[PDB]
Ligand binder design. Structure first.
Ligand SMILES: O=C(O)CON=C1c2cc(Cl)ccc2-c2ccc(Cl)cc21
Lengths: 116, 116, 116, 116
């Protein structure tokens, strides 16, 4: 529940299903340490990545594997993957939803940060 | 349930709350006939606009009153309102969600069309 | 050039060429009067719609005929057209660039406004 | 000019000026080698990063330093930077324009690719 990813397909107007998502956390030596991963569900969502206890303050990267999604559809894409890099902050609202809207040569990403 | 609107604020990373939304349907003389309206909830969503029986095939317009949302925040905006104009089709998936992502000088809108 | 429209295609990563654009201006009786129209060039841009002298203060609507663009590429898109509605020149003359980035089931519209 | 970066500010409706941009290229050992860097001009554009000769096939990463841009405007944004990762020149030389549209809690990134 503190980190959710939602991915939509702007070409088909649908959730983007079965997209691989890898989360990393930035280590003290500046490398990216694997943190969590999964595939989006039938509703384009990936829940259950981490817990409140482990999602401590720090810098995280969410990679969304957009190229493999488009290739499966036979559509030749621009980006290798979409990247979302941010600092997790204890002060603000407690839930972070990372949304991504995908097109072959463009994507947007937005963070919705809310309280239950 | 066949038509839902969801609105997000890209400046604050939050749902856009208390945004007025007016839906129109295009009449046989080409004018826009009021159809439904409401304000987005605390989660940025507006449900309950119409029913399956009345949401027949035709051209609809969804106006989102973005200027009043930004003015309330003290932020001077570009657009008078965001407009979403589309044909409702019985053939495709049965639920239409119109999403809008708002910034003072830009917005995106996406249609997610799915089956329950 | 006080008003310029630029349209890009997010499926192909290219300018959206030969897209029809209609501009209207709200009259004192509340109707939308035809103001100017044209088609985007090879660069996806439409210049020459108006002059400083004719582009007076007002509420303008830029209608970008996105459905016909997609149909001619074999795509059946969600929206009929993208509309951009804004007050212009209400604090003196400005230059406006209205951009639209198109995908079949999504678009974004942006304005860059500069003071000559 | 085979690689050009353009950055716009969706809060102000303006070019995003003096944004730092770092370009990297993936080496055969998988590390990201520094390739070129610069800052956007008054127009929000960064030209002159590379030459046809140096811009060979490869996987490139364009890192746009959006956090520092917002902080200097008094805004505490969500993302550390926007990353754009793509394979270039894998079917011969192309021209690439990488655009980013920024808001505090959202960005979109787009590419227009043309064949000289
Ligand atoms: O939405 C993006 O990712 C940036 O796209 N917007 C673009 C863009 C994108 C590209 Cl690749 C080239 C030019 C523009 C442009 C020019 C004027 C204006 Cl007002 C907007 C834009």
């Amino acid at each position: 529940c503190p980190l959710m990813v939602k991915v939509l397909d702007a070409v088909r107007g649908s959730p983007a299903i079965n997209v691989a998502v890898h989360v990393f956390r930035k280590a003290a030596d500046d490398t990216w340490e694997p943190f969590a991963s999964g595939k989006t569900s039938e509703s384009g969502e990936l829940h259950g990545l981490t817990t409140e206890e482990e999602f401590v303050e720090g810098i995280y990267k969410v990679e969304i594997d957009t190229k493999s999604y488009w290739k499966a559809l036979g559509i030749s894409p621009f980006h290798e993957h979409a990247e979302v890099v941010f600092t997790a902050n204890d002060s603000g609202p407690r839930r972070y939803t990372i949304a991504a809207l995908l097109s072959p040569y463009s994507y947007s990403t937005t963070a919705v940060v809310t309280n239950p």
